[PDB]
Here is the input.
Amino acid sequence: MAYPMQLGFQDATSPIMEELLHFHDHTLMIVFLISSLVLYIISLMLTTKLTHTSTMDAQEVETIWTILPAIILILIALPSLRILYMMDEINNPSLTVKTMGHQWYWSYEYTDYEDLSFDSYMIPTSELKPGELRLLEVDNRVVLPMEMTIRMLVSSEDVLHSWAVPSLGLKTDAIPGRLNQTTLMSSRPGLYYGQCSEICGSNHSFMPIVLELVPLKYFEKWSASML
Amino acid sequence: ITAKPAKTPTSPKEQAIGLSVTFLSFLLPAGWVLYHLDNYKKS
Amino acid sequence: APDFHDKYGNAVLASGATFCVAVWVYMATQIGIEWNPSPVGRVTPKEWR
Amino acid sequence: FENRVAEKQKLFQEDNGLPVHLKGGATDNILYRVTMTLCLGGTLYSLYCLGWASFPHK
Amino acid sequence: KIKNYQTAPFDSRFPNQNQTRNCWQNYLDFHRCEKAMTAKGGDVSVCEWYRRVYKSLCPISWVSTWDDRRAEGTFPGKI
Amino acid sequence: MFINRWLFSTNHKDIGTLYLLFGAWAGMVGTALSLLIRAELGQPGTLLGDDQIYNVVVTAHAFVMIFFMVMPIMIGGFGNWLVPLMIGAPDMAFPRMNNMSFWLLPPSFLLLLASSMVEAGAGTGWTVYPPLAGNLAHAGASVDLTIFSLHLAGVSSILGAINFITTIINMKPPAMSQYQTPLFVWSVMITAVLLLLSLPVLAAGITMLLTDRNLNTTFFDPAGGGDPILYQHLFWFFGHPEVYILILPGFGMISHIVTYYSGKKEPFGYMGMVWAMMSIGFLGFIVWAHHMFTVGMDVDTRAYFTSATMIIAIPTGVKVFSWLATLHGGNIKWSPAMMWALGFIFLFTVGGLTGIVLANSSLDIVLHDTYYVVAHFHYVLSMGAVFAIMGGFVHWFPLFSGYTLNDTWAKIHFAIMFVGVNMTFFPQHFLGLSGMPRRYSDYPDAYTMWNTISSMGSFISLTAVMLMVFIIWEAFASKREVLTVDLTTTNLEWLNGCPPPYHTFEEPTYVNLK
Amino acid sequence: ASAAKGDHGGTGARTWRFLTFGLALPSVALCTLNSWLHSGHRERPAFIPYHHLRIRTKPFSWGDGNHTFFHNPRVNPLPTGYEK
Amino acid sequence: HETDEEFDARWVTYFNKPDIDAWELRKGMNTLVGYDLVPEPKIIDAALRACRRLNDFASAVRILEVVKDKAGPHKEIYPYVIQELRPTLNELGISTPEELGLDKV
Amino acid sequence: HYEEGPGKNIPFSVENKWRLLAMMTLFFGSGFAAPFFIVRHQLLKK
Amino acid sequence: SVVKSEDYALPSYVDRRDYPLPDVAHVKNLSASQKALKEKEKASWSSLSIDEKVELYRLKFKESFAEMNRSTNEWKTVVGAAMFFIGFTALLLIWEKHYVYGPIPHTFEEEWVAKQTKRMLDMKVAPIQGFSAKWDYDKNEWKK
Amino acid sequence: HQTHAYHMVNPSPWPLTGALSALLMTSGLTMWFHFNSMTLLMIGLTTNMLTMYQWWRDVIRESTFQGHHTPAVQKGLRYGMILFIISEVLFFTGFFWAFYHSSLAPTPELGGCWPPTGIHPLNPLEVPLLNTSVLLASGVSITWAHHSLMEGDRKHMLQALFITITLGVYFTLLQASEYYEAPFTISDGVYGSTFFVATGFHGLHVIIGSTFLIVCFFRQLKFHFTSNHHFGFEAAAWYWHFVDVVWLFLYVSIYWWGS
Amino acid sequence: ASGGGVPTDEEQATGLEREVMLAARKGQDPYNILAPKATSGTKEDPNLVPSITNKRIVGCICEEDNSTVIWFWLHKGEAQRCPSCGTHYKLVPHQLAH
Amino acid sequence: STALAKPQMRGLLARRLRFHIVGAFMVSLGFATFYKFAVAEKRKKAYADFYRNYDSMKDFEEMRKAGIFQSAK
Ligand SMILES: CCCCCCCCCCCCCCCCCC(=O)OCC(COC(=O)CCCCCCCCCCCCCCCCC)OC(=O)CCCCCCCCCCCCCCCCC
Ligand code: HEA
Ligand SMILES: CCCCC/C=C\C/C=C/C/C=C\C/C=C\CCCC(=O)O[C@H](COC(=O)CCCCCCCCCCCCCCCCC)COP(=O)(O)OCCN
Ligand SMILES: CCCCCC/C=C\CCCCCCCCCC(=O)O[C@H](COC(=O)CCCCCCCCCCCCCCC)COP(=O)(O)OC[C@@H](O)CO
Ligand SMILES: CCCCCCCCCCO[C@@H]1O[C@H](CO)[C@@H](O[C@H]2O[C@@H](CO)[C@@H](O)[C@H](O)[C@@H]2O)[C@H](O)[C@H]1O
Ligand code: CUA
Ligand SMILES: [O-][O-]
Ligand SMILES: [Cu+2]
Ligand SMILES: [Mg+2]
Ligand code: NA
Ligand code: NA
Ligand SMILES: [Zn+2]
Here is the structure.
């Protein structure tokens, strides 16, 4: 989850989110440098009483100012597109889990072997147990085995929603009539939070996601106890 | 640009009046609504 | 002849500056705003379970 | 039919300072007044219908 | 006859984020196979794989609505 | 006389004045809605109600600031006043149809206020996506009043576009080629082609939404074989060009302000600026799916929309550098309008740079529908389009009125607004990176500090807006009448005095071919 | 293509009139023949209550709310089947 | 483009034209100052003598002020230009802006 | 014809600066006040 | 001297350091003694007094370069008034907190925060850099 | 007195009355959809027609009767009409995009096929082929009308323009009959939605273009057009070719290829 | 196959349309449809700028292909010069009214 | 006294531009070096050192014992 006064991304929980962090660091340096160079050149242009107001020849300098940005763009797009396809790669999941968006809560279905399904609703602020996070806790968490490739399939039974877990780098829209696929692999056990990320009516702010990542043996006994 | 001196000068005091009246005109109705929000909600 | 800024420049800068610092420091500290700063180095963690 | 365009050009070029939309005569005035009465009439009725639709009917 | 099924494997016919046709095709394959079998004096157990795959992929409410519509005579796919 | 003059106008200056007054009023409406947003978010918990009332306010803020404030001021107000002066034309091609473009906007704004008054308003986002926006999740009149409001604003602008294109092509002096018209004139013509090509596609998509809501069509409804994602394509097909429509007249006013207060007779690299604005208009039509990176699109499609969106940086960078090269060697006049333009150049560049971060589909997975996007688009709208508007307004106020503003108050106004908009939006980058979604009426506790500062900033912008009203009142109250304006040889719109006669260029300019 | 006519001396009224009467109208008269021949009613199909057809998310703003604007009793069944 | 020497020569020629008129004098000075240079003493010398032929004392003093202005922060250039112009200032009776108190704000 | 010149090419009068202040206050003040009142109208329904 | 509105189409005077010789004289009407001064300017300028030379300059031009380029105290007024209106804004924020905002949620109470902080540490929130990485699980305190 | 060739238009009330008619039509439709009532709608449609009538009337007064349409003004009208047509092409483009999107990827609710299960398309060789022959024939008649007008032949102009209008009316009556005979409706999923909305707006455009042609026919009867100056006829002809070309696209995409 | 019955412009054009038509037949351009061709622009050979009043705005495109146009009012009297290139212009006032 | 030396009088603005743009370029290289050492590599090294001897089961057992989990007591 996010922590107070946070500036940047939540720490990466998956190899893909870690790649996004390094690619954002690379792109932010380019953003700072270009922004800084603009500000500095503006201040340069404005700090002299020397003048030169006759017609100025443009084509020479226009070369520099088209080619250097072209090159900067290629140096962004190369790692950008490496990551895109890296994310698209085949992986062979061990498990498929569906989630259906509703106004205003998520349901989950794990139907590889038994018909396991349940609803996951925000814990109302009046019923949080001490230590618990406002707007973020659910009653029934989405228990998943850690260190394993999981296919998440996302849709909705009413309006649009969007299923997101920032520290895994995940966000997949929940569209009715459509089954969208993403993959999820957590490098660590623990609790990982997200929130509905498409506007969906009165309780849009109040239909969060919590993944509980644990060892496979714990996952299997939990699954059996949820039948 | 150059311009003539004002045809109808607005002194510091007339400006303080135009400024107050202008601010009050945005502040007082919205202030009245935000102030009475509770009345509206648990009504 | 001295204009408005020759005559009143210093006092407007001095008074604007002082008023601005005073009222923002008051607003930031004295009326119960919850800034929700980092607990790091500030909060002693307490048993919750 | 006969080509009576020359008569209409004399009528519409008469130096009587009327704007083009009234320059055909009294009938233009009538048609103008009917249009603008319906428009202004209808617009007040739309405001009435907004204010009616603004409140629940129970 | 090839099991230890965990979940539905990658299928090169449906390589993209939208998996709706994967669920749909496997639902049709299972019910088509069952119909061939139920009729011709053979056994539905040969249809198993399609049933596993569509059970894995398809939202419960889709299967349930599609089942209701086969019952009703209103299922628009060809079986 | 008064009705003849102001309700029946066929005069491009008076119509330009009507659009400035209409846009200035809408601006107060958009500002109030923007303060209601930041009041809800200014402390943790619930102020107004749940997300429905909150999102009615967010939707209306966006529609009013875009359709009733920026477009009518830049295109209706400045385009109408300055375009015919700048080409020595006696009026617009269609001076009577120009007046109906104006007169369709109060009805459109009435339909938008009506939607917020009936039922529970349209809490949809200004993108109005179904199914949230269809007849089951938004039953009753509000969304239909919204779609009608858009149809009238879309008609007002299509007819305007036709009028502006025809005027700029057909009514220049016969010696003046298109490559001897000023940059602002080019920016309005390019904007008008974008309006012409993009608004009919919007009108088709919102029409289809109207019929799924009222005539039992299922364009966007899967039960009938329709697709919610089809609406998003048709909307963004308009929606991307529409943000180039919101900035291009800004770019043209910026070129003229920067050239003027540098004491230059011409902008650096004129044909490069023409090139850049046409390239931006073109590439602005082939990139719309970068609003749809998380909907479930094929990876090659994502890859294409990434790269084509990024290319827009090249022509856009030639313009930023050419503004800097126009300042180079200038006799710099530190007027309040020049401060708005300098602010524009730096803060539009920061916001164009975070648009570049967002072009990367991979990173956009995590940034999409978060406040990082909100920070992006306010750097370019509140510190880009709005800065060009304020720069343009204070520069041309003496032309349009015949009176001077007090420059010291206008500098004060600048400084306040500059502090408030940066305070408001800068910390939204951090709320974005850290995961705070869009269109939330309340947020997990962790997000408290940046939301508190953000809302304090929005109150500082409030104070600037109120002060701006006083500053315009003070000008009209003192009546300091303009005498001489510099650089008229390269700024034709000043050449007929301040304000120009009701009729100008009754006798056309003389320009020979040579 | 050249279609297979000829002509081109010049572009005149006389030519476009030739084409209106010697090609365009006779094509209309021939399609008029073709259509008003394959006319006559076809056997309405068995009614099946498909959920993707006869959609009703909101009543129509005319009649009884359940009839389409150009409702034809012979060939347009209602959500509950054909009219009796 | 041309050498610096040929640039200067074209400007000395422009101002030396015996019957240069007031318009040409103004157009020449107003164009000249748009360039990224402070004009060589020989060019200023020729402009001053055109001022003389035109019976225009005040424009002579303004041409000296604009030389100071074009130097920007390079405070060494103007007194060097005046040093070089001294015999012409003496021969023509042209007082500098500083001798006239016109450098006082 | 129509009046030409400063203060005369506008649909509002600037003849008296205090009447102007009241007209401008009503003009900008009603734009800014409208969304507060619509919020209040919404809350008061339900 | 007096510039009129009805003169806009006529060449006009301007003081600009980039346009040193404007299109008209600052003063065109001459008194008797100013006329005599212009006749005397046709003879040697060495015979003009210092006052005559100043007067000739002031007929031609309005302000000298040092006068037109002078700096002002305007920044003081500007920065001071800006800070005044910014400090005004904090009064609005005071009013809002007093009369509009109710209590913030109980999850900001000091004991809640300490427990929640413990729980975030137990679940190792951001263990690599952002949060739990700053806690020393061995010494049971915040890292120095 | 002006010494340029452009038209300074008399101050007019029609922009206001047309804008208010737009308010009255949109709020009328809202009232009809949500409050069971037609009144505001029929008031809007009335003031809309009145507005169009007076405004285009005055254009005829200012051109034919007052002589303000110099060549420069005509050229501007030419651009205006072309740009207007461009806008209408892009409006139809959004409905073709809708149609291809749904028919190229038919969803499971449709049976995953196109045409959907339970849809029986019209035979494109019957009335739709007749409609096609009609509009193409009317493209040939209106070109004859144009050439006769340029050559100064009032009788053949009138004859060809009349045959053109008669075909436009024919198409409209055939289309009205196919709507009534169609076994599917607008409520029959995305098939009926794309079908009736796209052909419905096309048919609305046939009705507008046929009205514009009838206006040219009466102004011709009254000798308003000269052999060289007749832009309203040219604008009506361009618009009629646009309505023809849209049809050909509908016929190939929806009736033939989507069958 | 063809009779008449269609009026011509010569018979039926009126107003400013007719004034333009008739002036064009005389080789005249009273409504400024055409771009004037420049003379050499010297003081002996100035660009002659017709006007119906005592001043007219000139735009000067000093060199072929300049995008920047130099605008200034030209007044009755002595020839004036473009402030950018010095080319000479002279106003030739009056009449148009036949 | 002494005459003053002839100073450079031409290309003063161009010269200043050239010197500062090259200044800007050398600062830009210095900043990227700071950036790649203070932010980017720092990140790469915090991640790699975290996971070098990371024991995920031991991490799980500490969380379980602290009572955070629904599926694992
Ligand atoms: C408003 C209150 C902000 C509170 C600041 C938070 C405290 C920092 C903790 C102090 C540090 C403590 C250690 C924590 C390290 C965490 C690193 C991280 O995880 O990394 C991610 C972070 C890292 O960001 C930061 O580290 C702070 C931003 C620094 C950017 C320079 C601007 C200076 C900002 C401060 C004043 C704002 C004025 C707006 C400046 C104008 C708009 C840019 O998040 C971002 O990506 C923000 C995205 C910004 C994109 C816009 C680029 C604009 C650049 C302008 C260049 C012109 C030069 C300024 C010259 C500026 C003069 C005009
Ligand atoms: C005036 C408004 C405006 C403008 C001009 C732009 C300009 C751009 N925008 Fe943005 N944007 C919006 C308004 C605007 N935007 C709005 C309202 C939204 C959200 C809509 C919604 O959902 O409601 C949005 C959303 C949006 C998204 C969707 C993000 C998402 O929702 O997840 C994306 C994705 O690419 C995008 C990108 C860009 C880019 C690349 C540009 C480019 O045009 C910027 C180009 C400029 C520069 C790059 C800076 C100047 C250049 C240089 C100095 C040269 C060197 C630079 C480099 C080498 C990189 N924007
Ligand atoms: C006769 C041949 C030509 C047809 C014309 C006849 C009448 C309709 C007029 C045309 C308007 C065009 C399209 C508008 C929407 C739908 C109409 C589609 C054409 C049509 O008429 O569809 C009929 C349905 O009409 C219905 O719902 C009727 C609903 C009528 C209300 C119109 C709804 C509002 C229209 C939206 C206008 C927005 C305009 C866009 C503005 C653009 C701004 C830039 C088909 O009838 P059916 O019984 O379902 O099936 C036949 C079974 N035997
Ligand atoms: C069922 C109906 C419901 C909706 C109502 C629509 C009804 C139908 C209206 C049909 C359109 C009628 C147009 C009549 C125009 C007559 C005026 C005219 O045609 O004027 C001509 C100028 O062109 C001009 O303005 C030309 C301007 C004409 C543009 C018209 C084009 C279509 C507009 C219709 C709106 C489309 C709506 C589509 C929905 C998205 C006049 O110049 P000339 O002809 O050169 O004459 C001069 C000579 O005499 C000199 O010798
Ligand atoms: C988002 C923009 C808004 C920013 C905040 C504006 C600052 C508010 C300005 C003052 O507003 C007034 O405040 C009074 C309180 O100070 C309210 O009086 C209420 O207060 C009581 C005093 O407690 C009573 O005396 C009165 O009857 C009254 O209703 C009054 O109605 C309201 O107009
Ligand atoms: Cu579900 Cu937002
Ligand atoms: O749209 O960016
Ligand atoms: Cu976009
Ligand atoms: Mg989204
Ligand atoms: Na809140
Ligand atoms: Na023709
Ligand atoms: Zn020139």
The interface with chain L takes residues 3, 5-6, 9, 13 of chain D (CB under 8 Å). The pocket of heme-A (ligand 2) is lined by residues A 34, 38, 69, 72-73; F 127, 243, 246-247, 290-291, 309, 312-313, 316-317, 320, 349, 352-353, 355-356, 358-359, 364, 367-368, 373, 376-377, 380-381, 384-385 (CB under 6 Å). The radius of gyration of chain D is 20 Å. Helices of chain D lie at 5-12, 26-53.
